[PDB]
């Protein structure tokens, strides 16, 4: 019904947010795959060889039926140990990516919700303007049929009356495409929503912009993720750097191998029936000294990328400054506009009342009276819309601060009210 | 010239679409690469080594040589079998992408083509308006040069002329840039096209919206794709799962060897010239027991990706319902606008006539006659557009239902009549103004 | 303060560019990592495998120590000689992508600059319109309070006034936001900038469209990129075909090996207990004969990924042709518009006079005068806008041709001059 309920429905099922979670889940899951090369590697092998001879070996055949039980255990691989915390970091970037997506859904739903509401008001005023213009056309028509007004007055009215009728068409189509926006976001169709309580509508000027900036610094999400994506780039310098380092591998094994032989070749105590069993343990030290200049090159790029991710951060800061500062401007302009269009509506109404009392003694005409109606319901339109802009602007500030949430929608119920249906608000 | 014939000219050489064709062609070609590890691997290899013992092997100097054939045909290797049927899926997906593109080029030619006409109508009507203003200015200067009207009726009229004159410089430019956009779509410049036949024009009610949805639900190319990618992701679970399974390789070699020792402690019969030839047939078998928790971690990743692809499916669905329902609404709001602007042009006209008669007997002024001229050629414009919006929205549906077709472009030259041009009509700088 | 100076402060700091500079730098660097396999590989390993025994070979317990400087050097591997150039080409593709970023910054900085400038004018005229309407509301408020007009005149002006007040709020806000958007691109807040000099302002007709198209063909970075990338795709065809070739490989190694048996039946020959010092050296030859039609499949793909890279050029060509031709159209319609509005302002001012005249005698009413004010400070707003669009459109052409640089901004300094503040009023 109202916005909170609509969102609570929407978070329950919305693809874009769930698909974001699945990415976060996998990104956290993949840590275990990053840890695995540091854990015991155990395998089983089995061989069936067979031989022959045809030169010096003048036809010594044989065979094998071998079997292993191989173990690997890295005791010191720094590149491997580094690859784990890279994937842990990667999971962090994805979790911040996800929280960013939780706020986008709120904003997207609020907008979708207030787009529909606003669309209803544009249709209501269009209908109202239409009935106001039609009143004039109908009345002027009656006066004309008894010769009290010229034919011209009637033909000017009918013209303006048909402009609006076409306008109403667009407006009822726009409302019906707004509800379709909201159906795609929420996953549901709503015949009625909570209207805006116009009486209960107040305005609160925002916090100081330097205060808003000082906080955004701490809690903006695009900004934190940036500080994490850069930190990851730094760790990749080291993984590349760990190419200069040696490694140590424990490798234990156990196996059996029984062996046969053949025709007319040779003989003992040279060879035969064997049934070799053997257990093995081993430490493989292995250290790169110079492999083509690769490791130095891989560090350089990892560094250029770090320098690059350093730039994406300042970029992410400048966008936070732009958005916070421009959201401050925008909410202040909304409060200035609401107070403007309010005033406007009043004088638009009093000027219309003047046009009509003017039309009725000669100083004005039907075109003026009609033109007075159009400006009246345009002021009326623009006012109502400003209120919706102001609410959305309260939310965009919250978004820029990276602190948008359930409670900000919950708070918005103070200004909502009576249920309104969708077209027909006929006809 | 007309819409059918322009599309054909675009279809044959559109670089966007042929780029897709390559992507398709290549993605099918790779199947023969996804099969390659499941076939006889034959490799020939020779070498040469020299040794030199210098510790307790002082005076031991080998000098070897080898050849071989190799063969490592694989017998049971499920992952390779998998990646083959995977690459197949990747191609089937890539193809549906291509089939979508063919439908996108039909659509984007349709729009580009109708955008040009819309751009001419707007220029025709703005030019028309401009001369409707010029007659009232001209005849007013006449009435003034002999003193039948005051000069203020001349200077008021001159203004409205100049704001429409500017209005025309834009409407002109937009027709240029429309023909240029069209050229980008179809590689070609067009000096004239087939106009919309206003008289041979009729508007039909569309099918019921719930019928279109289920139609769209079974035919939508965007939808089909998302299903095959969810299905694809489903498979990659099973691929990740075959990491618990064992491999069974068949091997076989055939290689000479001539090792001939040298040195000072090559005295015994360990040293001599051995020329061991050989002929092998192997059966290597591998089966992993535990890899630090990898294969399970890989599977759990593959399952989250399946949820992902499953949610990408829902997205594709919600986007079709939005597209079908909205494109339904606009058909019904085009029809209503075509009817409402037809009526608005009748009224905006008759008003202008009474405005003039009114001006003529002093109950209105020139600034009313001119004001009514504007709302008229604004209604002619709003009307012409409602037609094109209807036709355009009619194609948006059939695209959403995955059945956008040449048959439909053909079925649109059943409303295209007399050819009209696309460049100047026509700068008239006198000046009076 | 002016566009040259502002862009200078923007070129030095702007992060989008500076990152792209670190992406060029790191594709040319990676040339070194493409070359490394043609160069001597050297390692060092210290084996230690203790080995126990059981079943038929029971009681025989060795344990080995080992060290060995390993060395590799490719003698012949063509697709290692080919992966290198393939990474020099991709580097060259980066450098062009960088050069495109250089010009975008110029266009961004210019577009941002003039948006603030034009935002100032719109706000300025809006206020001119406001004070203009206020006078009319004011003097006929007086003429009402002494019976010289009816209340209808006051209330008409009083309403059209309020429309402008509302408008002024938006116009002021737009300027505030427009400045912040300049602060992004630049990293600076600018109190005042060099305003456009409109007395000195002149419009030169462009070159011929066919000269621009011929010019674009040779110098437009989006085309050059597409060419280098197709030439990249061609070189990936040869890399695919390179799978049919032999692989010569020198290797060498010094090494040692302490072994020491310990146990029961430590009594025979074919196994040894040595301390070898091997100085192995030798050539290695590898040649594929057949791999399940892999290489052939990888060539038909590379060939398809070349008609792909080729059709992808006709796309890039149809794009530049559009941006060269349409932006030529746009600049011609700019010159036209600037002229049409120059007139429109002139004729709408003559008309505003004619209304205030007709009002004083009864041919035109209070609304007639007001509406003429509205038209006047709308022709002027439009005349002002048109001049900036023309200016940007000059750059959009230098952009399409792919030859946009500093000097084009330098040119846009004879056109600037007197400073104007960027806030109230
Ligand atoms: C590059 C990361 C900065 C921390 C390292 C200290 C300063 C860089 O020192 C570097 O240490 C490497 C160690 O082998 C060498 O290969 C480099 O040649 C050397 O310049
Ligand atoms: C954008 C809409 C255009 C119409 C706005 C016209 C403003 C009103 O203009 C009026 O028209 C009257 C008709 O009798 C004339 O007598 C007067 O010139 C004037 O009061
Ligand atoms: C009941 C104990 C499993 C042995 C019977 C084989 C049938 C179950 O299937 C097994 O599921 C496991 C999932 O952990 C996999 O590791 C095995 O590869 C798979 O064979
Ligand atoms: C029956 C089809 C057999 C296809 C296999 C040959 C495909 C053609 O590829 C050939 O491969 C040779 C390397 O083996 C190259 O030397 C030739 O230049 C090349 O033409």
Author numbering:
A (entry chain A): 1 to 427
B (entry chain C): 1 to 433
C (entry chain B): 1 to 425
Which passages does the manuscript contain on this structure?
ST50, an outer-membrane protein with the molecular mass of approximately 50 kDa, is expected to be a tripartite member of the resistance-nodulation-cell division (RND) efflux system because of its high sequence identity with TolC (89%), one component of the drug efflux system AcrA-AcrB-TolC in E. coli. ST50, similar to other outer-membrane proteins involved in resistance-nodulation-cell division (RND) efflux systems, possesses an α-helical barrel domain, a membrane-embedded β-barrel domain and an equatorial domain of mixed α/β-structures. One outer-membrane component of the heavy metal efflux pump, CusC, also possesses an architecture similar to those of the outer-membrane multidrug efflux pumps. These tripartite efflux pumps are able to transport diverse substrates, including metal ions, dyes, detergents, antibiotics and protein toxins, from the cytoplasm to the external medium of the microorganism. Currently, the principal method to diagnose typhoid fever is TYPHIDOT, a rapid immunoassay test to detect IgM and IgG antibodies against the outer-membrane protein ST50 of S. Typhi.
To identify the immunogenic site of ST50 and investigate the structural features of this antigenic outer-membrane protein, we overexpressed ST50 from Salmonella enterica serovar Typhi in E. coli and determined its structure at a resolution of 2.98 Å. In one asymmetric unit, three protomers of ST50 form a functional trimer through interactions of the interprotomer H7/(adjacent H2, H4) coiled-coil and the antiparallel β-sheet S5/(adjacent S1). The long extracellular loops L2 between β-strands S4 and S5 exhibit varied conformations among the three protomers, and the B-chain possesses the largest conformational deviation. The distinct conformation and the large temperature factor of the L2 loop in the B protomer result from compression on the L2 loop by helix 1 of another adjacent ST50 molecule that is related to crystal packing (θ/A-protomer = 103.1°, θ/C-protomer = 100.2°, θ/B-protomer = 71.8°). The periplasmic entrance of ST50 adopts the resting closed state through close interactions between the α-helical inner coiled-coil (H7/H8) and the outer coiled-coil (H3/H4) through hydrogen bond networks, similar to those of TolC, Oprm and VceC8910. The hydrogen bond network comprises four key residues: Thr152, Asp153, Tyr359 and Arg364 in ST50, corresponding to Thr152, Asp153, Tyr362 and Arg367 in TolC. Four bound detergent molecules of n-octyl-β-D-glucoside (β-OG) are found in the structure of ST50. His244 of all three ST50 protomers interact with the β-OG molecules through hydrogen bonding between the imidazole ring of His244 and the polar group of β-OG. Our structure reveals that one β-OG molecule is bound at the D-cage, which comprises three sets of Asp368 and Asp371 residues, at the entrance of the periplasmic tunnel.
